[PDB]
Design the sequence.
């Protein structure tokens, strides 16, 4: 999504969005109904209800954002940023890590 220079929004935005695009392909292929993304499948909105008030305010917007920033944080070059997620959410991290996958390309 990517503005401006790296006042960090560019980079951390682009990968947030990227997580959301992973949720997109995952929802097209997996799940079943209208509900557009793989978010809020598996174990009905559990992970988001608890942990989706802790990672940040974006972790508490739509669940599709909670997942997207969870993706960001999961891979953070600042590895401590990742441990903020596991520490504060010892199941959301594991969720994106369950969905460790291989969408695209490159």
Sequence:
């Amino acid at each position: 999504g990517s503005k401006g220079v790296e006042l960090r929004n560019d980079s951390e935005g682009f990968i947030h969005e990227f997580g959301h695009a992973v949720d997109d392909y995952a929802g097209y292929l997996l799940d079943k109904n209208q509900s557009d993304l793989v978010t809020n499948s598996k174990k009905f909105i559990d992970i988001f209800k608890e942990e989706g008030s802790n990672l940040t305010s974006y972790g508490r917007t739509n669940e599709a954002e909670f997942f997207a920033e969870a993706f960001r944080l999961m891979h953070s070059t600042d590895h401590a940023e990742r441990l903020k997620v596991q520490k504060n959410a010892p199941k959301t991290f594991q969720f994106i890590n369950d969905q460790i996958k291989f969408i695209i390309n490159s």
